[PDB]
Design a protein around this ligand. Structure first.
Ligand code: SF4
Ligand code: SF4
Lengths: 143, 159, 67, 33, 720, 80, 94, 733
């Protein structure tokens, strides 16, 4: 199968002067995110929080406040540069949840072993009227 | 002279002369709110004294009765009423924010990473003691300002 | 075995309620012969829908041959 | 006794204060069952 | 453009709108900088041709359908008119009695005063100018065709900013100022002196005679008898007769002294000729703009201004944004300085012209500033690239944009409270019968002491800090001098009190809010905490869906959309302030005994400190002229007043609603047309979200501005 | 959290998966269409409700549907 | 954390998330002993939040009502009442 | 059930300020609450209705008590035409002394407000005479409010909770509400008029302590039993009767006079008593139609199933409608709201032209206020009816159980209905606006004789047929000889003809071209508002743009920027759009009413007749001309009693303008700003010790539409109320 990579906490971060668009109390109390990648050389890139940074040669680790920021930066890395990346979610107690790419293959590429979730085997016009689910606690699309 | 806060480029803050000057650090650390190891009651006393003392002037000099031989009493009474409202609102914030017996929500790390005792202000009992000190000090400061202005009648530029 | 569905170029009428071309007329392009294909009939229309598309896939019982 | 001089402050100032305090404390409660 | 736009949307009407919306977005058509530059050059030639045609029209209408010759003989009691209407369906009532045996529409453009200042005395000269302008328009059109389809310049030619600055500073402005100074010295000065001497305009000598006969010009200024000898002998004092430093106003015509203007333009020409030799082009002398920019470093780590030359050399939009900001500010300054120091003869006592010019140039300036914001945001979205053209200062600004916007937000809230809340306080105190508690001159006073100090300094300046000046630069500063022309006040000292303090802080509030909107649009055009990849969505997009709580109007374009409304608010308040203050404290009639009666009798000081005062004494009282105009020559103003209210109301349908409703309704209408076999060939669609917003804001601004236009013109023509 | 559903009219074009800004969707094997794959939505706890996926879908009517639901910190896209 | 340009450490999340006390001081009490004793003695009964809220609300309302009911007519115009004959109404209305 | 709101876990788990707002907004939508059942829904509705009754009783009790305690009812009784009634006293510590002087009116010892609700005339007409009567009424209504609260609590306990079958009993409820709620109440009110109010109109004071010892008629019940009913009409009050006294008083208790009381300018009390007697008996007859449990009576279901044409184009007819009505509460609410809105408009139209309260016709400010108030309420109710109809179509309609009946066919040809309504609106708008603009252009060029002035000949013919002789026509009831005229010649013509031929009143006012133009404008408003609401209702389940709309509910923001963009596509958004048109239509109606009446009252009807045919006439001669006294309510030279209305005028303009901000700017801008504010707060020393517990977010899209509409409506109403009251009362009191 696929063994998710382990997060190495001794990975250097890009050279950056700091900004007002970084982490806030949510990272302290709720959660934050970490994106890691490997760069062939040292080069300038655009931060998703504003301003420009310099990625070092070798491994790079970056802390961000939302998953959407991680995916935006990862798409920029994959499209503009040619760099493989992966990101995780980090909780206040220190536990780490590997997030993306979930099984080592990008979601847009079909892969065996994935279980379907939220599939209705009918056309969208076959959903029932709301009156048929009144007082039942269900949704007309939840089948 | 502008650096990331505590050397961390990816925390949403910066170090500037406004934020990190040694004079600014000393002044902020010597205010009652940042005396983390001192009793909340005495810090509340100081804060209440200061604010109640300063609140007398606006009410006394700008109110509807400013041109009446009872303007000073009206200003002092208005300051006391505002202090009462602020004390009620402080009690409301304390009751909503802190449960009884919960540990302090203040940070327990210094700028250099040394662990410290969490500030007892951010607790139910500590906030209640601070609020009591604030109310007592506010009333006392308003009375003291009134006594200086309209009892002894000391020479002031405007009174 | 004979192929399923109408022939290429056949004029058909759409019976799918939520289709943009419901009760309209389209032309058959091709029919998928795989038994597992749930919507094998490919239909092309003269007018685009709100998304700018002018072709769609339908089942055998969602179309009616008209002359 | 001038009743308006007593009731107008109570209905305009004191009662709104008590109602707002109670509603704030009610909507801030983390456990209401 | 036509082929691709048609191919994108051939089956639906939407393409038609796109065909017009993206006509001049050259950067979207091609990516080659050289072709874009060539298109810009040709389009500029087209704009110049249109402007020349407009000038030709103005001069020809002055020559053919005007009472300029009659007005020249009696400026004070004759109204300028240069538009006449045909007698159809009864519209000939618009040809009102303006004076001097002429019936037409009275104009407020100030062209008669400009032509008088230029020395034009006959219709033939106006005809000649119109013909020359038509020739210049044709030449501009031919040059526009030639420099694109035949002789397009290369990219390296356009990027020669040193040469462009040298030519535009020393050649365009310096030589233009010098040549106009020559005209003023040799043509306008003697003609205007003869006119002020009460000479029949048809008996005044022709201008060329003043060139071919020195004796004629020496009778007015003896120094001309010595010719050019004093100039070469450095004895310039001899030219003190026609090159003066008086200050103030000419008591006969109510404008600035012409000799002061000639001396000013000579000095300006010299200054620009000096400034035009700064940059190095081809001879190894002069500065380099890149070197100057790279030579200004700073203690904040690396040098900041390094790299700006590359950005400003390879982006049309950045140049357009900066130039728009500067030109709009210049227009606003022009409005202020032209009202306070009237440069044309008989301009000060023509109240309608003064009001019109001030208001018009204020509107132009405001629109230009908003355009500057829009094209700055476009540069951020399209041309910003840190990996190729990096600049330090822009990076630092982007790294503390949050702090910038938060501080600006706070200052806007503070200004709003401590300015508008004072008016609300005054209204509440007045309604409650407590005038002694208001913020007024006869109550709690808020005096603008710094402005009064500046006024006093500028009033006492002559003889101490400006020994060579006879009087101050303006009669508004003070000094106790009133200038009256034909029984009407031109200018006099303008007092400043509590109401002025309040209204000035109102202006500061509105400007800071408009800046907040536009600058927020610029600094977050590429990304935000809410939308990390906003740059990929583009400059002009309606939203990114109802998720994240809802994301309507996040694009920089929508920031321009809102900034337009706030600019309209601010400028409207500015022009209302001007109108009321001038009518109340400056304009009026002076009797033979020196008694001054102002148009509204000095009610500004006490009435303008409450909102009800503005509602009653400004809007309600002064709308009387526009609403009672039916049956007179000004009835067109009443009709336009109603029509503009109608257009403004119409805009709210687009602004308040959304396109899904309209598309669903169009479905039923299409069914109805299909049933009768009259179906359109192109499928009808409702307007896009962005187009709906554009239509709404355009009709809102048009309605409001036109309403104010009709109100102002009717009032000032009927009472001033 | 919002709800996301896939209907059997899907032609397996993968455009919705590519358009998602928070990696909610993916592609899994199928035999109901020529492309032999169908979309799936296993990570709706990260869905913000932008509806880019619906904008990308080419079928009539839509084969991916987003139903807005109870709001959370992730769905509201809060960074504070 | 803070070693060779490293800002992430699973063994110290407080440092990694920047949960510091920028200006908090650990110095002892600067106040005089007798002064602190006096203030601890005389401000003690106001330190109970549940009692303080009710006391503040009820006592403040009572004081406000008492002040309003006892205001002098020369200070408060609404207490003084009209001092002039009424103005006539339109078309003879009273 | 963890935290507020307890009825929604989806909201209770929301960590933003949104949780609070929506908690308030969804509190009364019982069907959407967690784990709701039908029985609980009906029981909660019953308890809420008891609460509404309690609030109404408390409101009326307060009005009575404050009039008794601080009013001048007894003095107003003595001098009705010259004394201004007092609503309540003013105690405002922010007042200055001049305000205290200015607001002292009506003989009071201090500042007061003047009432414009008309309660004085109403209570005087129904027999109330002293302050003690008002006090007793106030105490009784307070007791009724307490009883309503007790019953609302009682019918919510397990012992006394009714079952669903009781709630779904239509026949019994209809019989009880027709025979009991309407007929018996009307009979009791007739008893009150005969026993109390009519004697009070003649100097006889009848109360609870002597009403058993005073005969309403001199001969008692003799004429009723013997059948000589006409004896109850032979001696009516004479034309020289003074309303409060016995001078000229008669003895009749039921008559058919018609016309107006010459002194009070209102309807005879005797006619009102006879009318209510007849209506009571009609409702008593009507209340015995349906079978409940006795084996006699009609079945609503059988009647609905029976009416099916054999070959007509109606399909299955009304089959299945009984179940649809009885199972959908929203359908019932829609029908009830439609009926109540129609009734409210009819009340407004009939109370100004046929006043029933003594001396209220002379109180011009009260008449204008009542008409405007009830017309705006009617407009809001009309919008609500269609809103709940669309809600019915979404939540309750089941196609399978409504196959080929009227609802299914109405859904089936919705395009034709929408097209015809659209055509009617386009025709009306084009031609009405064209006529107005043509007249404005003719006035601008100084040729007023070239106006297009079309007479409303149909309405003039109707007025002539009802007896008016202004236009010179010879239609029925205006000719000397005629069958209809002769049949009613002695019945009621002597009073009605005299009433219609006195132009001092508002009974069948003379009309001309301006009336024609403005009536077609009102028609345009009605048709366009109906178009918006009906399109919202019929498209509520889906359309080509969004074929699955029913799965998304009544109210949702949009369906995203795809498929061309889908803003304001829900049925709730259609209601939101229709509120603006309702406000515009009612504004035209009330402008017309007020201008026509204010020109009539000054004795200058030529002003309206000449100026109303072009729009500049409305702008100048109605708004601008009548705003002067209002805007001089306070000025640099002082203030008067109109200052409060001037302040309210400006307040309304401000709230109206504030609504534009929510309506024009949308959410994303504000959310981006709020994030910056959150950073600022977290970074500021001495303030970051304070922490929010609900994360700040910008308002939602639908919430913004609602808040903007609310600010707009409040500003609209307050501005016009200030103008109307100030303009009328400054001239008339
Ligand atoms: S309402 Fe319109 S602009 Fe706003 S998110 Fe929905 S589609 Fe986009
Ligand atoms: S609505 Fe947006 S976040 Fe949710 S699944 Fe679709 S694309 Fe992804």
């Amino acid at each position: 199968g696929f063994v998710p990579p382990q997060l190495d906490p001794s990975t250097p971060s890009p050279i950056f002067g700091g900004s007002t668009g970084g982490l806030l109390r949510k990272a302290q109390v709720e959660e934050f995110y970490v994106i890691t990648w490997t760069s062939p050389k040292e080069q300038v890139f655009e931060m998703p929080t504003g301003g420009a940074a310099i990625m070092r040669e070798g491994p790079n680790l970056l802390k961000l406040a939302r998953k959407e920021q991680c995916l935006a930066l990862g798409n920029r890395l994959r499209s503009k540069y040619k760099i493989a990346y992966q990101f995780y979610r980090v909780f206040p107690n220190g536990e780490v949840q590997y997030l993306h790419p979930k099984d080592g293959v990008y979601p847009e590429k079909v892969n065996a072993g994935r279980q379907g979730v939220g599939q209705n085997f009918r056309s969208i016009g076959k959903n029932v009227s709301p009156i048929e689910v009144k007082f039942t606690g269900k949704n007309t699309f939840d089948v | 002279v502008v650096q990331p806060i505590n050397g961390d480029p990816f925390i949403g803050s910066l170090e500037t002369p406004v934020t990190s000057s040694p004079l600014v650090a000393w002044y902020l650390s010597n205010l009652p709110a940042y005396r983390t190891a001192v009793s909340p009651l005495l810090r509340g006393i100081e804060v209440g004294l200061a604010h109640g003392y300063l609140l007398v002037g606006p009410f006394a000099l700008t109110g509807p009765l400013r041109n009446t031989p009872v303007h000073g009493q009206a200003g002092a009474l208005g300051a006391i009423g505002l202090v009462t409202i602020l004390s009620v609102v402080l009690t409301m914030y304390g009751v909503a924010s802190f449960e009884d017996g919960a540990p302090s929500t203040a940070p327990s790390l210094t700028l250099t990473g040394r662990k410290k005792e969490a500030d007892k202000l951010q607790t139910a009992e500590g906030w209640a003691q601070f609020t009591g000190g604030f109310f007592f000090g506010g009333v006392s400061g308003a009375i003291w300002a009134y006594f200086l202005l309209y009892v002894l009648d000391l020479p002031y530029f405007f009174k | 075995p004979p192929p399923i569905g109408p022939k290429r170029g056949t004029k058909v009428k759409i019976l799918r309620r939520e289709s943009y071309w419901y009760n309209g007329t389209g032309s058959v392009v091709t029919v998928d012969q795989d038994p597992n294909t749930r919507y094998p009939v490919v239909v092309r229309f003269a007018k685009v829908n709100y998304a700018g598309v002018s072709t769609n896939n339908y089942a055998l019982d969602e179309i009616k041959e008209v002359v | 006794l001038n009743l308006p001089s007593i009731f107008v402050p109570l209905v305009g100032l004191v009662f709104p204060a008590i109602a707002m305090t109670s509603l704030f404390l009610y909507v801030q409660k983390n456990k209401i069952v | 453009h036509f082929s691709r736009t048609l191919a994108k949307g051939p089956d639906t009407t939407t393409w038609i709108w796109n065909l017009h919306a993206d006509a001049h977005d050259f950067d979207s058509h091609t990516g080659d900088l050289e072709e874009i530059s060539r298109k810009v050059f040709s389009a500029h030639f087209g704009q110049l041709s249109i402007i020349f045609l407009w000038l030709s029209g103005m001069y020809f209408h002055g020559a053919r359908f005007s009472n300029y010759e009659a007005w020249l003989s009696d400026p004070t009691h004759i109204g300028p008119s240069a538009q006449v209407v045909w007698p159809i369906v009864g519209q000939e009532i618009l040809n009102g009695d303006v004076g001097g045996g002429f019936r037409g529409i009275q104009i407020t453009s100030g062209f008669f005063q400009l032509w008088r200042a230029s020395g034009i005395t006959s219709e033939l000269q106006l005809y000649c100018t119109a013909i020359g302008a038509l020739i210049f328009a044709a030449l501009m059109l031919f040059a526009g065709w030639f420099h694109y389809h035949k002789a397009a310049p290369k990219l390296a030619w356009f990027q020669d900013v040193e040469s462009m600055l040298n030519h535009h500073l020393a050649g365009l402005l310096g030589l233009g100022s010098l040549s106009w100074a020559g005209h003023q010295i040799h043509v306008s000065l003697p003609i205007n002196q003869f006119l002020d001497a009460g000479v029949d305009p048809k008996e005044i000598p022709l201008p060329h005679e003043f060139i071919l006969n020195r004796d004629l010009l020496a009778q007015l200024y003896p120094s001309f008898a010595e010719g050019a000898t004093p100039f070469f002998t450095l004895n310039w004092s001899k030219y003190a007769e026609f090159l003066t430093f008086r200050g103030g106003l000419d008591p006969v015509t109510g404008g600035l002294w012409l000799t002061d203007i000639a001396h000013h333009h000579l000095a300006i020409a010299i200054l620009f000729l000096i400034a035009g030799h700064m940059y190095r082009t081809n001879w190894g002398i002069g500065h380099g703009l890149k070197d100057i920019l790279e030579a200004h470093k700073g203690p904040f780590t690396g040098q900041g201004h390094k790299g700006l030359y590359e950005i400003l050399t390879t982006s049309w939009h950045a140049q357009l944004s900066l130039n728009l900001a500067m030109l709009g500010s210049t227009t606003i300054v022009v409005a202020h300085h032209m009202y306070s120091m009237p440069p044309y003869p008989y301009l000060a006592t023509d109240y309608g012209t003064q009001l019109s010019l001030f208001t018009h140039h204020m509107w132009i300036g405001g629109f230009l500033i908003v355009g500057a914001a829009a094209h700055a945001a476009i540069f951020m979205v399209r041309d910003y690239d840190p990996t190729t053209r990096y600049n330090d200062l822009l990076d630092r600004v982007l790294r503390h944009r949050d702090a910038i916007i938060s501080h600006l937000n706070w200052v806007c809230i503070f200004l709003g409270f401590h300015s508008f809340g004072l008016y609300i306080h005054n209204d509440t105190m007045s309604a409650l019968g407590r005038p002694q508690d208001m913020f007024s001159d006869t109550a709690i006073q808020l005096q603008p002491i710094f402005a009064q100090w500046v006024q006093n300094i500028h009033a006492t300046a002559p003889g101490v800090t400006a020994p060579g000046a006879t009087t101050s630069t303006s009669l508004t500063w003070g000094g106790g001098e009133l200038v009256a022309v034909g029984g009407k006040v031109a200018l006099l000292p303008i007092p400043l009190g509590t109401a002025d303090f309040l209204v000035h802080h109102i202006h500061a509030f509105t400007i800071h809010v408009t800046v907040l909107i536009l600058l927020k649009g610029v600094l977050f055009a590429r990304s935000s905490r809410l939308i990390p990849d906003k740059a990929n969505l583009g400059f002009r997009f309606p939203c990114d869906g109802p998720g994240r709580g809802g994301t309507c109007q996040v694009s920089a374009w929508d920031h321009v959309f809102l900034g337009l409304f706030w600019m309209y608010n601010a400028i409207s308040v500015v022009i209302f302030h001007f109108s009321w203050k001038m009518q109340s404290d400056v304009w009026g009639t002076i009797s033979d005994q020196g008694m001054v009666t102002h148009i509204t009798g000095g009610n500004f000081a006490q009435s303008s400190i409450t909102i009800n005062g503005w509602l009653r004494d400004f809007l309600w009282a002064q709308a009387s002229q526009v609403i009672q105009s039916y049956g007179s020559s000004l009835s067109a103003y009443g009709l336009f007043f109603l029509g503009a209210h109608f257009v403004w109301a119409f805009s709210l349908m687009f602004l308040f609603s959304g396109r899904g409703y309209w598309q669903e309704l169009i479905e039923s209408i299409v069914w109805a047309h299909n049933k009768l076999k009259v179906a359109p060939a192109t499928q009808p669609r409702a307007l896009s979200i962005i187009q709906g917003r554009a239509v709404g804001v355009t009709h809102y601004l048009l309605g409001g501005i036109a309403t104010t236009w009709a109100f102002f013109l009717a009032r000032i023509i009927a009472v001033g | 959290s919002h709800s996301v559903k896939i209907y059997d009219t899907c032609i397996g074009c993968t455009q919705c998966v590519r358009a998602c800004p928070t990696d909610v969707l993916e592609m899994i094997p199928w035999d109901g269409c020529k492309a032999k794959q169908i979309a799936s939505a296993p990570r709706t706890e990260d869905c913000v409700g932008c509806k880019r996926c619906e904008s990308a879908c080419p079928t009539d009517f839509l084969s991916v549907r987003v139903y807005l639901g109870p709001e959370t910190t992730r769905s509201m896209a809060l960074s504070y | 954390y803070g070693e060779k340009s490293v800002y992430f450490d699973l063994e110290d999340i407080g440092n990694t998330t920047g949960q510091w006390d920028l200006y908090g001081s650990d110095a002892p009490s600067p106040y005089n002993g007798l002064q602190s004793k006096f203030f601890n003695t005389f401000a003690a009964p106001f330190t109970k939040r549940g009692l303080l809220l009710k006391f503040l609300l009820l006592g403040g309302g009572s004081l406000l009502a008492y002040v309003s009911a006892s205001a002098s007519p020369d200070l408060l115009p609404i207490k003084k009442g009209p001092q002039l004959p009424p103005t006539p109404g339109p078309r003879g209305k009273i | 059930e963890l935290r507020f709101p307890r009825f929604s876990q989806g909201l209770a788990q929301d960590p933003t300020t949104r949780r609070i707002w929506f908690g308030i907004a969804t509190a009364h939508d019982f069907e959407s609450h967690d784990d709701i059942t039908e029985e609980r829904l009906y029981q909660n509705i019953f308890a809420s209705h008891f609460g509404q009754l309690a609030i109404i009783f408390l409101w009326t009790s307060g009005n009575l008590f404050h009039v008794a305690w601080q009013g001048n009812f007894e003095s107003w009784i003595q001098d009705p035409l010259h004394v201004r009634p007092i609503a309540h006293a003013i105690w405002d510590p922010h007042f200055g002394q001049p305000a205290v002087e200015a607001f002292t009116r009506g003989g009071a010892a201090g500042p007061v407000n003047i009432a414009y609700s008309g309660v004085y005339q109403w209570w005087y007409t129904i027999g109330l005479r002293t302050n003690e009567d008002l006090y007793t009424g106030a105490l009784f209504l307070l007791f009724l409010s307490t009883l309503s609260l007790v019953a609302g609590w009682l019918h919510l306990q397990p012992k006394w909770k009714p079952s669903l079958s009781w709630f779904k009993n239509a026949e019994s409820r209809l019989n009880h509400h027709l025979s009991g709620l309407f007929g018996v109440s009307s009979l009791a009110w007739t008893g009150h008029l005969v026993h109390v109010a009519i004697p009070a109109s003649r100097g006889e004071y009848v109360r609870w302590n002597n009403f058993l010892d005073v005969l309403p008629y001199p001969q008692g019940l003799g004429p009723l039993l013997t059948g000589q009913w006409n004896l109850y009409a032979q001696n009516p009050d004479s034309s020289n009767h003074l309303f409060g006294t016995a001078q000229g008083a008669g003895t009749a208790i039921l008559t058919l006079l018609g016309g107006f009381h010459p002194q009070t300018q209102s309807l005879w009390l005797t006619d009102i008593a006879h009318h209510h007697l007849a209506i009571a008996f009609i409702f008593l007859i009507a209340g015995h139609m349906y079978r409940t449990n006795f084996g006699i009576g009609h079945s609503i279901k059988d009647l609905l199933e029976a009416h099916t044409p054999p070959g007509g184009r109606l399909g299955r007819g009304h089959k299945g409608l009984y179940d649809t009505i009885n199972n959908s509460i929203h359908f019932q609410l829609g029908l009830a709201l439609a009926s109540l809105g129609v009734i409210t408009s009819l009340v407004a139209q009939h109370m100004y032209s046929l006043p029933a309260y003594a001396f209220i016709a002379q109180d011009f400010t009260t008449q204008a206020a009542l008409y405007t108030h009830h017309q705006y309420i009617a407009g809001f109710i009309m919008t609500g009816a269609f809103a709940h109809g669309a809600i019915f179509f979404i939540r309750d309609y089941n196609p399978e159980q409504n196959e080929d009946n009227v609802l299914a066919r109405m859904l089936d040809h919705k395009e034709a209905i929408i097209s015809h309504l659209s055509w009617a609106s386009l025709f009306l708008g084009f031609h009405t606006l064209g006529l107005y603009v043509h007249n404005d252009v003719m006035l601008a060029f100084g040729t007023p004789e070239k106006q297009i002035l079309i007479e409303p000949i149909f309405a003039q013919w109707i007025q002539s047929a009802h007896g008016k002789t202004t236009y010179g026509f010879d239609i029925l009831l205006s000719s000397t000889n005629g069958p209809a005229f002769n049949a009613g010649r002695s019945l009621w013509l002597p009073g009605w003809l005299n009433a219609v031929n006195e132009n001092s009143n508002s009974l069948f006012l003379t009309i001309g071209p301006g009336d024609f133009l403005v009536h077609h404008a009102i028609a345009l408003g009605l048709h366009t508002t109906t178009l918006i609401l009906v399109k919202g209702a019929l498209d509520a389940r889906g359309s080509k743009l969004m074929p699955d709309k029913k799965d998304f509910g009544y109210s949702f923001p949009c369906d995203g920027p795809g498929r061309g963009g889908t803003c304001d596509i829900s049925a709730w958004d259609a209601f939101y759009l229709a509120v603006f048109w309702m406000l515009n239509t009612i504004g035209w109606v009330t402008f017309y009413w007020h201008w026509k009446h204010i020109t009539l009252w000054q004795g200058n009807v030529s002003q309206f007749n000449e100026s109303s045919t072009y729009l500049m006439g409305w702008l100048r001669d109605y708004l601008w001309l009548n705003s002067s006294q209002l805007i001089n309510g306070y000025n640099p030279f002082g203030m008067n009693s109109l200052s409060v209305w001037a302040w309210m005028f400006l307040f309304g303009h401000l709230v109206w303008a504030t609504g534009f901000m929510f309506l024009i700017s949308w959410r994303g801008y504000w959310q981006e700003l709020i994030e910056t504010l959150a950073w600022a707060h977290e970074r500021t020393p001495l303030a970051n010790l304070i922490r929010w517990r609900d994360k700040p977010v910008a308002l939602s899209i639908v919430q913004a539409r609602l808040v903007g509409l609310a600010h707009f409506s409040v500003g609209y109403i307050f501005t016009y109320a200030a103008f109307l009251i100030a303009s009328t009362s400054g001239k008339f009191g």
